[PDB]
Amino acid sequence: SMEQVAMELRLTELTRLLRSVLDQLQDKDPARIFAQPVSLKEVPDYLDHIKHPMDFATMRKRLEAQGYKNLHEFEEDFDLIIDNCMKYNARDTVFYRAAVRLRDQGGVVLRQARREVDSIGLE
């Protein structure tokens, strides 16, 4: 149907915007600490601690499959990256501190993303 195609175009539009947002957020992780999933070979107990692992590569895979229906779902996954890190790692670590900086700098980006999604009406 035509209505279905129009909804699909809206999803494609949202995906384009979120790709730009994802690129901007990942730029705030210059150390690439959050670029890839935590390795279960190198951290074998990780899933005993963290029940829903997340990372930028995994978000990008979901994004390119148009798997985020709205900004809230995208933000959920970004918050997992930060929140998982701040639980597993202690405050005095480069990992925790990178997550704080990513959260703070990312908030700026997500503030304007929300306005743009509302403004152009993408969800």
Side-chain angles (χ1 to χ4, degrees), residues 1-2 4-6 8 11-15 17-40 42-60 62-68 70-119 121-123:
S1 78
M2 200 138 136
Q4 283 162 10
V5 166
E8 287 162 5
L11 177 60
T12 297
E13 272 329 276
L14 177 67
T15 302
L17 179 157
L18 294 180
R19 184 178 304 109
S20 173
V21 177
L22 189 57
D23 288 343
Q24 290 179 66
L25 293 175
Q26 189 156 19
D27 286 338
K28 309 302 181 163
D29 171 30
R32 298 193 70 84
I33 288 165
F34 306 106
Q36 297 292 330
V38 173
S39 168
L40 297 174
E42 304 172 350
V43 188
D45 77 346
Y46 192 66
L47 299 188
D48 294 340
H49 293 263
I50 296 306
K51 295 306 169 176
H52 300 101
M54 191 48 54
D55 64 276
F56 284 128
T58 300
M59 289 189 66
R60 199 170 292 276
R62 180 166 169 188
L63 177 68
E64 293 304 323
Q66 300 192 340
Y68 294 113
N70 56 53
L71 177 61
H72 182 78
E73 296 190 341
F74 179 96
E75 284 197 48
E76 285 192 346
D77 272 356
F78 178 66
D79 286 333
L80 281 176
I81 293 177
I82 295 156
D83 295 338
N84 290 344
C85 183
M86 293 176 70
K87 294 173 184 67
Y88 188 81
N89 303 284
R91 285 189 292 281
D92 62 343
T93 64
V94 62
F95 308 106
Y96 185 111
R97 288 167 179 277
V100 168
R101 290 166 62 86
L102 175 59
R103 183 195 65 189
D104 290 349
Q105 297 180 253
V108 179
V109 172
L110 287 173
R111 177 202 188 267
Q112 196 53 42
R114 163 55 61 195
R115 298 191 63 88
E116 288 173 356
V117 169
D118 294 350
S119 171
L122 265 49
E123 66 188 346

